[PDB]
Design a protein around this ligand. Structure first.
Ligand SMILES: Nc1ncnc2c1ncn2[C@@H]1O[C@H](COP(=O)(O)OP(=O)(O)O)[C@@H](O)[C@H]1O
Ligand SMILES: Nc1ncnc2c1ncn2[C@@H]1O[C@H](COP(=O)(O)OP(=O)(O)O)[C@@H](O)[C@H]1O
Ligand SMILES: [Mg+2]
Ligand SMILES: [Mg+2]
Lengths: 21, 371, 371, 185
């Protein structure tokens, strides 16, 4: 132990389709 | 290398770091699945909502509780609960952080084996310790002796500790807490005409129980006053805008903790369980345990419960001796606060279950390294 | 003085006298009101038709059911139903006869308050009593213990009784019965091109369900048989002379009892409800409840339902034991027949609710006297 | 049926186009029914004129708001069903409780039957009378809602995600014409 211690979306899709028409 | 404390309670998962005052992420333990037909294509349809997302969208979800009376039933749902509380709430890698989990006493051992196996093989850690919740409540209380009644959402258990020594023969467990109070509150809410059958309506009746119910000091006089006058009646607004009015159900719901024969269970109340746990202890230490009744858990948030516990135990105890009910105002998170105290203790570094010890001993060292 | 048994069913009122075999008056609980303009002056054009007159003249009437899922909504209509079943059907004065009434479990209490108040003020009686229908069914089955699934037109409830002790925590209630099956058959009959939207057409769809429908022993094999060959298709003649032919709708309609997710109800099927009611009982009595599954109610006469329910419970329960579904052929009126047992008991005569008890206790003694 | 009251007869299917044109151009939804009936009975401020293709001129009064009132009151043409406001409200109560608020704030109408220029305020009044008073009744009525079914069709067909949801030729060739039940709603 001493050695170890030393080691340490609906909205976006639908608006996209609206702007596609 | 700081430490994580993750009380995986039946109702509310409470997680946070070591040394912090308040728990960082408190969220209910529900896995919600859709039950209707998704017609609107795209949109990122999740097959399962976990946590507050399942709480918000609960009107179209079948909710499931993975933990029932402190025993984890569905392990995939509990894996998703751990995945949510690590990778979405706290946003921490568990491979660089030890973890302190809490557990009810008198549990099935295979449950402890399986949290050991998942927590060292799915979410593999440098270290993990499984601890009894009542000892953490006595940590947060700060006193060394005391009997702790911890009542979460599924488990109400009494553990007495004197001068740093637990008495395992006097530990008792009762599977009666806030989930059964929610079900009983539905069953008595059908008297006034309000129907609640779905898993979503458990949340609404739970909110009614949290916001309006209270422990009566005397049950019979409160029954007579609520039957006579409509002063104790209170109105609550539903999420659809309707207004319910409840009267005696404010104090008939928590009285199941003092009278478990309402839901048909044979066992006696929590005060009798506390008194019988003290009589199961040795005769010299009962003077300390009468004066240091520590409650914890979210079931004791009702604003009459300390006076009722004092009255019932002072009725049961001999009258030559003081009863004092220790009820801190933050006793909901006292399991978490005592876990954060324990993880910040310098002495606690030597009894971590290492990955090395797990590999060299199988999943069997958790029976011998822990309590 | 002969007692009266008046089962105010959700779809069919069944009244009669004690000590008898068959119920005296069985007639549906409908209040009709005219929806068209009467140009023909005179000849006794009634403002309201109650019962079989409203059934016969249903082409020009809006029919209202006063009872919905066991709960009496409209009270003036329910008073007209009681006035018809006392004065026109049985033709007896209520004030010279006691009158037991039946009730689904977990009813709102104000419903019981109002039936007691109406039944003691305007149809005032020497006595009345309100009981549980499943208890009457277990009487009519002639056996001491048993779990009774009673499924009427509105309420499907499971009540288990052992040695004359009902277990009140083990009572399950599900609002899925014959009206919901009639509405679902209306919903799926539109697929074949037959439209039924009016309340007159509800009686036609109800008669289609009563005549032709049956429970599938295996659902998916009956899908395969109906899709493959046209042997299951059956014809029915409408009152205008049109001939319909229905196929899989003979066994899609009752399957909602076993699969409630068809009509969007989150709850489990009646087999799982029965199984969970037996699991809520204590462990030493479950074998007796397995051998005494009593089915009653009007919904339970589809001619494949006993074998299906036996198959489902035998799948659910472990194999060491006998699952015997008690399904008598006369199980429509068996609740009434149970009243013809219970009101004919000399021991029963000392728990009637008298007039003097009502006047000295308000309408509150119906909670304290009845279960 | 009610244009015969004033004196105007229309029986052929060619005349159905004329009666439909009168309904499109002159009719409107009354906000309050009985006040509008009393107003039309009192004074002829509500009467409007329309010229037929032969050249005759009709003038109609209360029939401007008796005809669209059948949507909120189906007993005029002798149907037992409830009005469209009660249909909307009953569809909301047949849903689960927790979502009902989102159904109140997002009442969407479409189709050309809701072109009448009083129907949004009337439906708001009817639902507001039906709903509890602590709640918000927002009715969306876009001006383009006569063609919104086609607009949403162009919206759905412009998706990338919808290209796998079609019923192709080959799948019809194995399954017969029965795959449209299992593939579509
Ligand atoms: N203000 C309140 N009043 C009454 N009961 C409450 C209150 N807050 C929480 N509870 C109950 O306490 C439980 C929370 O206790 P907790 O120990 O956090 O449960 P868990 O850790 O198992 O989720 C909840 O299930 C709830 O029913
Ligand atoms: N022969 C039959 N087959 C199938 N279902 C039936 C038959 N006869 C009646 N039913 C259904 O049973 C219902 C009658 O139930 P009922 O006996 O009144 O129970 P309750 O008294 O509890 O309401 C009717 O609504 C009808 O839909
Ligand atoms: Mg807890
Ligand atoms: Mg019945």
């Amino acid at each position: 132990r001493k050695q170890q211690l030393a080691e340490e979306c609906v909205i976006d899709a639908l608006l996209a389709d609206i702007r596609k028409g | 290398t700081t430490a994580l404390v993750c009380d995986n309670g039946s109702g509310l998962v409470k997680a946070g770091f070591a040394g912090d005052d308040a728990p960082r992420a408190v969220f209910p333990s529900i896995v919600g699945r859709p039950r209707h037909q998704g017609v609107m294509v795209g949109m990122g349809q999740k097959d399962s909502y976990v946590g507050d997302e399942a709480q918000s969208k609960r009107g179209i979800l079948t909710l499931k509780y993975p933990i029932e009376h402190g025993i984890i039933t569905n392990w995939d749902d509990m894996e998703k609960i751990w995945h949510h509380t690590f990778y979405n709430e706290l946003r921490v890698a568990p491979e660089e952080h030890p973890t302190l989990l809490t557990e009810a006493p008198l549990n099935p051992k295979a449950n402890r084996e399986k949290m050991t196996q998942i927590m060292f093989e799915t979410f593999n850690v440098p270290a993990m310790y499984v601890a009894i919740q009542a000892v953490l409540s006595l940590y947060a209380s700060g006193r060394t002796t005391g009997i702790v009644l911890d009542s979460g959402d599924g488990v109400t258990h009494n553990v007495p500790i004197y001068e740093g020594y637990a008495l395992p023969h006097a530990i008792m467990r009762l599977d009666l807490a806030g989930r059964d109070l929610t079900d009983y509150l539905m069953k008595i809410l059908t008297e006034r005409g309000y129907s609640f059958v779905t898993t979503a309506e458990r949340e609404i009746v739970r909110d009614i129980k949290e916001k309006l119910c209270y422990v009566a000091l005397d049950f019979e006089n409160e029954m007579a006053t609520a039957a006579s006058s409509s002063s104790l009646e209170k109105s609550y607004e539903l999420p659809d805008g309707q207004v319910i009015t409840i009267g005696n159900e404010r104090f008939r719901c928590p009285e199941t903790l003092f009278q478990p024969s309402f839901i048909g269970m044979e066992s006696a109340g929590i005060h009798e369980t506390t008194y019988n746990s003290i009589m199961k202890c040795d005769i010299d230490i009962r003077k300390d345990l009468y004066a240091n009744n520590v409650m914890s858990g979210g079931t004791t948030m009702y604003p009459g419960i300390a006076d009722r516990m004092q009255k019932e135990i002072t009725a049961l105890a001999p009258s030559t001796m003081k009863i004092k009910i220790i009820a801190p105002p933050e006793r909901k998170y006292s399991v978490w606060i005592g876990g954060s105290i324990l993880a910040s203790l310098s002495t606690f570094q030597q009894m971590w279950i290492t990955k090395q010890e797990y590999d060299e001993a199988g999943p069997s060292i958790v029976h011998r390294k822990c309590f």
